[PDB]
Symmetry: C3
Subunit: 256 residues, 3 copies
């Protein structure tokens, strides 16, 4: 299981069942959950906690210190969930004292080659981060978010549930749930109707959401004016309340 | 000698004459490697994969991996690499998928630069250059002498025509015809790689037939069918224009405009 | 020891006494590493190269490989890196070409983030910052205190001015004057890196001058000679303006507008 060419630091805690490939480093205070498969040439620095049945591929550096000068070598943390996939050369950095001191990844998230998850970035579940997708720092990605290849997400930006970025998107403002965004700078185009039929969203909920969009983007309404309109469809449909709440948590602004 | 002992060469692996494998490089199960190919250190080779003669693969490259696009993978899908290719630091080449060609194909004399990516089932021809972090996103066909500038993105199923040029940070979404220069995100069509044509020792008549050919397709409100019918004479006259007419003809998915 | 025993230290390498080199890192022939510098694991150091004092080089970085550039024929070119620099995970830095000055120079106190690229013959000055996946083509001169944001691209022979700033995903085809802010693909100008000046503690008097100097090049519809002329006066009165006008003078490719 643990290849004899791996460096498993004394103060590790590799729960039994964990595979480590040759020439891989498991650093200080690195909890690796059970069922996991660490590939070869993988560096794990801590203090870090990895969940179960994850897979980390060759040349990935999970749990390093952000290079951000502001951060001054404090003993901060990173937490990955169960059933994730972390592809070749992905970098995932631990938190900062200037925020939550915990970088957090949830469950069932696919994180493709040379993706970056900067300090204090919080990822939900069932997400897809395509090759070279880069989360600046303090980035929240709610469940089922698909970010196309080479998507750049600016600091403190919240990516809504079931949202979708086009290839080479540069996201500066918050992406509401279900919304699709494209180009640099990113601009709202439509809802992610494919992503709704993936959940088996009722044709009413898809149609109620198709409306909920026009209210925000194509009816000349201020944000606060828009939230008031939705509140009844938000009250009736749980799905619309995800979309409604996603807007309401954008102090800085929504991607238009 | 040529095989470094800190490397891991699986029993099934077939290493030909003059092959070098740097220290800590994995040559995986059912990886065939051809004459005088150099594998650097920190290279992962996963099979079933065929690598031809006199290739040079650099460190941190992951050649012949499975596409993550399918979470429950299929086997056996192939990666066929040809002869005299250069694959630079940290390149990622994925093998085919059973639901398409079931092979990723790379030809001869290609230059694939640092941290570039060739997605599953993508075909590459000869003398192609993929600049740093150029990314092909599955079932992509790249014909000969095609130059993709730094960080060019190619959408699923797009066709990169022969002698075509993409500007840096381009997001190609529709087919790129042979010779056509594309730029930006989404990629718009500007002109033709006249510089590339001249380097190939193309006749000035052929280059001027290709200049007048560009305008027929792009600049004169013709339908693709009208445009093709108009190129019939110039194409039969010049093999170089035929390659252009051919590339537009194969584009059912539409051409980059 | 400080030299981890699973490292390769070529006989002809010159490592200072207190140098640290982590496991499975190559330190090849005619590679010089100065005092205090800390090499991480899985690093490839190729020469002829010279690394200064108190540097840090993270896992998977390949410092001193040949440019894959075809015009390079395998000459004895050099790479030189100064003191107090930080080179993050999977950075690629290439030695120079005889075609230019057979050397790639990085100065002191520069932070170069993960999967960033520094092409052949590229001169990086002091206290610069290259954010994740920033790619410099070749013959690129980045002067002191420059901040290129994540996934910024820079064409051949482009010269990034001092205290200048690019935005994330910027694509730079022309020169960035000193202090200017450049954004998008292609790169556009949008007044100057003011908070950058207010950070280092630039004079209130000079910031008004740089603001009125910016109005000349960009906003008064002068030709570059008409603007270079109208600047001379204000440019003689202030160093900051001279450095701005100097950066404008030395633009071989033209300036970003
Ligand atoms: C789902 C797919 N996502 C990708 O990331 C494709 C990337 C291309 C470059 C190489 C790495 C993969 C996509 O369809 N993106 C898209 N299409 N139109 N606008 N955005
Ligand atoms: C072929 C070359 N490729 C490059 O990639 C140039 C840089 C090095 C790598 C990082 C991205 C910039 C190029 O110059 N393309 C181009 N010219 N004008 N617009 N695009
Ligand atoms: C300093 C920061 N640079 C970054 O690189 C932050 C992110 C790192 C990785 C994810 C994508 C960018 C920045 O200035 N961004 C910006 N603001 N306006 N235009 N660009």
């Amino acid at each position: 299981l643990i290849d004899p060419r791996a460096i498993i630091d004394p103060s590790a805690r590799l729960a039994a069942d964990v595979q480590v490939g040759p020439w891989s480093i498991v650093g200080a205070e690195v909890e690796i959950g059970e069922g996991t498969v660490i590939g070869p040439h993988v560096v794990l620095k801590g203090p870090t906690k990895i969940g179960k049945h994850n897979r980390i591929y060759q040349f990935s550096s999970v749990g390093e210190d952000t290079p951000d000068l502001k951060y001054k070598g404090e003993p901060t943390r990173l937490v990955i969930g169960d059933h994730n996939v972390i592809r070749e050369g992905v970098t995932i950095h631990r938190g900062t004292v200037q925020d939550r001191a915990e970088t957090t990844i949830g469950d069932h998230n696919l994180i493709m080659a040379y993706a970056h998850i900067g300090h204090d970035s919080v990822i939900g579940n069932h997400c897809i981060l395509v090759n070279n997708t880069a989360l600046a720092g303090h980035v929240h990605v709610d469940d089922w978010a698909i970010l196309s290849g080479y998507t750049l997400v600016h600091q403190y930006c919240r990516i809504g549930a079931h949202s979708f970025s086009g290839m080479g998107s540069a996201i500066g403002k918050d992406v509401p749930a279900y919304v699709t965004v494209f180009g640099n700078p990113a601009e709202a185009r439509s809802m992610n109707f494919e992503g709704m039929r993936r959940r088996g969203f009722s044709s009413e909920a898809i149609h109620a959401l198709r409306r909920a969009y026009k209210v925000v983007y194509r009816q000349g309404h201020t944000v606060e004016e828009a939230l008031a309109e939705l509140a009844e469809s938000a009250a009736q449909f749980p799905e619309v309340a995800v979309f409604r709440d996603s807007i309401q948590s954008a102090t800085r602004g929504i991607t238009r």
